[PDB]
């Protein structure tokens, strides 16, 4: 039962599910070329993908879905989930993106790739906004799980798929309750609780925009197949 | 003035700024569907600039900031308006009252059948939620101010529209649990709306607004 958990239990599951922080390929030729930077970043994302699937299976409600729909959700969300992880890692490094512990890149180093400096500016801006809002890890892991579930749910049809959508909205309602509980426990007024909830959820639309602009720039210079995701889930 | 508004003043202001539903101009099946939709889009744009000026707090921003917000939000604003008025026509998109299209007519343009399916799903989602017209106008204003984001003024105004949405839900008679849940349900659709807008721009660069263009329109 996924919809049985209390708000306090839900936070433990999400924090226990959290994937590890990984390193980039140790000691590349620095400084980077456009080819070598895209090599290291690609190397990192593909290794992070494996821990995202293991994370995804531990997110309450996800394993209850069919395998086909689990792939669909991850196929829509995987870049947004990498991006918010980056933005979260970066928080306490103003003007810098912490891709890995050994790969802290400032704004000016995005220039190497060309077109990329646009994407860096957007990722940095999101991290500034999180620093402005004083985003907490309990709130952060809740927003990641909302991205995983929400960002592919609209494209689903029979009585099976109707229940599958309804189930997802029920878990999304559960994660909303869990976000508000944390804000109430922290001692914000109801007016502030609602105001903060809205501000957090409106940042997910900017993350989607960053994801799309990111996908376009990646095709400008591969993207994860249905078979790779299914293989990683069952095995 | 904008920061001092009550929920009813905000809603009534947004309902009275609401632009009109226009028509496509075409008469046999001579058609050319893309130019027909572009003719519509361009005429709708002109009403959007005047709708934007009547949104509380927007006029208090510098005309540099007003152009940046509309440059980012124009296509989402057209889409939510299309999706809102398609609500009572499952399977069809009501571009104009004389231009109601089904998903087979979406295949008339190469690539757009993908975009059609997302727009019908958004409409399908609005129907399943019983999205109300007071909530609809609030969400358009949110899209205008959010997609681009002096900066703290914008966030102060967005906090008022959150207060407004919650007031309408409480007025409607929702429990506190249902209020904050329904708020989240509406604001998470904006993420899907943004995604559709990004897909639409890419699709339009296969077929077919500048910084100058929007600034020129805003002054008059
Ligand atoms: O031009 C770029 C635009 C955006 C990015 C970027 C480059 O660098 C990486 C990247 C991402 C995906 C990718 O995927 C390539 C396709 N792989 C192959 C398939 C698995 F086999 C998925 C290759 C490289 C990257 C971003 C966005 C910022 O957020 C990140 C956060 C992370 O934690 C890790 C990486 C990124
Ligand atoms: O491939 C397409 C992808 C998306 C659309 C579409 C075609 O049809 C029109 C469209 C939009 C803009 C455009 O452009 C207007 C002109 N350009 C030049 C610049 C100055 F105005 C903008 C030309 C055509 C359209 C959509 C999205 C669905 O929502 C709509 C709602 C409306 O109320 C009106 C139009 C649309």
Curated annotation (Swiss-Prot), chain A:
GO terms for biological process: androgen metabolic process; antral ovarian follicle growth; cellular response to estradiol stimulus; cellular response to estrogen stimulus; chromatin remodeling; epithelial cell development; epithelial cell proliferation involved in mammary gland duct elongation; estrogen receptor signaling pathway. Changing residue 95 to V: Destabilizes the receptor and decreases its affinity for estradiol at 25 degrees Celsius, but not at 4 degrees Celsius. Residues 1-235 are annotated as: Self-association. Residues 6-235 form the NR LBD domain. Changing residue 70 to H: In ESTRR; results in highly reduced activity. Changing residue 81 to C: Loss of transmembrane localization, no effect on peripheral membrane localization. Impairs activation of estrogen-induced activation of NOS3 and production of nitric oxide. No effect on binding to ERES. Binds DNA as a homodimer. Can form a heterodimer with ESR2. Interacts with FOXC2, MAP1S, SLC30A9, UBE1C and NCOA3 coactivator. Interacts with PELP1, the interaction is enhanced by 17-beta-estradiol, the interaction increases ESR1 transcriptional activity. Interacts with EP300; the interaction is estrogen-dependent and enhanced by CITED1. Interacts with CITED1; the interaction is estrogen-dependent. Interacts with NCOA5 and NCOA6 coactivators. Interacts with NCOA7; the interaction is a ligand-inducible. Interacts with PHB2, and UBE1C. Interacts with AKAP13. Interacts with CUEDC2. This is Estrogen receptor. It comes from Homo sapiens. The lineage of its organism: Eukaryota, Metazoa, Chordata, Craniata, Vertebrata. The chain holds residues 306 to 546 of 595 of the full protein.
